[PDB]
Structures are given as C-alpha cells and as structure tokens.
Amino acid sequence: ERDCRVSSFRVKENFDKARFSGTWYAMAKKDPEGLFLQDNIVAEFSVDENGHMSATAKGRVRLLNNWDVCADMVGTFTDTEDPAKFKMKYWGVASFLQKGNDDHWIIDTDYDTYAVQYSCRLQNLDGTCADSYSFVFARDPHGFSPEVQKIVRQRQEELCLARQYRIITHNGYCD
C-alpha cells in the first residue's frame, strides 16, 4: 500500500538554510550505484549574505583502482520553488574526483539533532526511484538517542528505504 513515487515524498516544511548551517556528521547512508563516499563523512554547510547555501564534505572514497583517498568535496545549492528541494552542483578539490549535479532534498530535520537527506538520480517510468542515495546526519558525533532513532527509522520507511542503510564510521582516516 506504500506510495514510493518520488513525487509523493514529503520534505521539510519551511526549511531554514541558516538554522541548518554548521557541521553535520553522517551517521548512516543508503548507497546509490557506482562510486561514492564510503565513510568518515563530515559535511559543513554555510549560507552567504545573499542566502546562497554551499557545503564542503570530506570522506574516504575507494577508487576503481582500489586506491583509498580522502576526498575533499564542494557543493553549491540552487533554490527551487520548494524551500527543502535544491539542485546541487558538486566537484572535488582534486581534479580526478567526480563532478556532478544531483537533486538534494531535505526530507526532515529538527536542525538541532538530526537530518534526513535524499536524492533520486534515476527514476523508473512509474515515478519510483531506480537509483537513489540518502544520508542520515547528526549534530553530535556520538549519534542519537533512541527516541530520535525512532523518528529516523520512520523517515527511512517513508522513502521506501527501510533496512537499506548502513552505519558510517569515523576513525580519523581523513584527519
């Protein structure tokens, strides 16, 4: 009975870019297809004078070579008609890192403790997502209380992603 069409997903009402600013530690992720950030993932969001949001993110990536590297990423976000839906242009500090443009949706956040992000890269003809990624972020590097765990779990179910996330660890590889 679950509607899994991307157009059906609810996103954060009246999303506030300034309140979302600062440091977020990725706690868990749902992988898309292909090359992606693996672990030790930390993003810092900021908003300029003109309200333009950008972010930096660091994380370990394993290259097609099996070459392990600490990627230093940059992203710039373009606002849309829905405050919680952006277009994210990204690139690496290193020329060999992937560059792209992804949808960047803030599904839910309380700004102070957690955030659930989503991106559908490829849709099926039926409107459902064929290739998606999702991060769960925390403000506190130690993670969340069981009560917040419950809220996150529900959002995971609502995106049709239950049981598809794995824990992201932080062990100083990129420090």
Binding segment toward ligand RTL, per CB under 6 A, in 67-75, 108-116, 144-152, 154-162 = 67-75
125-162: buried (b, 16+ CB within 10 Å) or exposed (e) per residue?
A: eeebbeebbbbbbbbeeeebeeebeebbeebbebbbbe
Judged by beta carbon, residue 23 or residue 145, the one nearer ligand RTL is: 23
Q: Which stretch binds ligand RTL (CB under 6 A): 1-9, 55-63, 142-150, 159-167?
A: 55-63
Contact with ligand RTL (CB under 6 A) among 5, 8, 18, 35: 35
Question: Cβ closer to ligand RTL: 71 or 138?
Answer: 71
Measured between alpha carbons, how far is 51 from 80 in angstroms, rounded to an integer? 13
The three-state secondary structure class of 20 is helix
CB neighbours of 85 closer than 8 A, spacing ≥ 6? 11, 103, 104, 105, 106
Q: Give backbone dihedrals phi and psi of 46, rounded to 5 degrees, phi first.
A: -145, 160
- Binding-site member from 9, 21, 36, 160 for ligand RTL (CB under 6 A): 36
Q: Which residues contact 101 (CB under 8 A, 6 or more apart)?
A: 87, 88, 89, 90
149 marked as part of a ligand binding site: no
Q: Does 43 bind ligand RTL (CB under 6 A)?
A: yes
Query: Shortest distance, CB of residue 73 to ligand RTL, whole angstroms?
Result: 4
Is 73:58 a contact under the CB 8 Å cutoff? yes
Q: How many residues bind ligand RTL (CB under 6 A)?
A: 14
Residue from 6, 27, 37, 136 binding ligand RTL (CB under 6 A): 37
Q: Restricting to residues 97-156, name those near ligand RTL by CB under 6 A.
A: 97-98, 135
Asked if 25 interacts with ligand RTL (CB under 6 A), we say: no
User: Known binding site for substrate: residues?
Assistant: 98
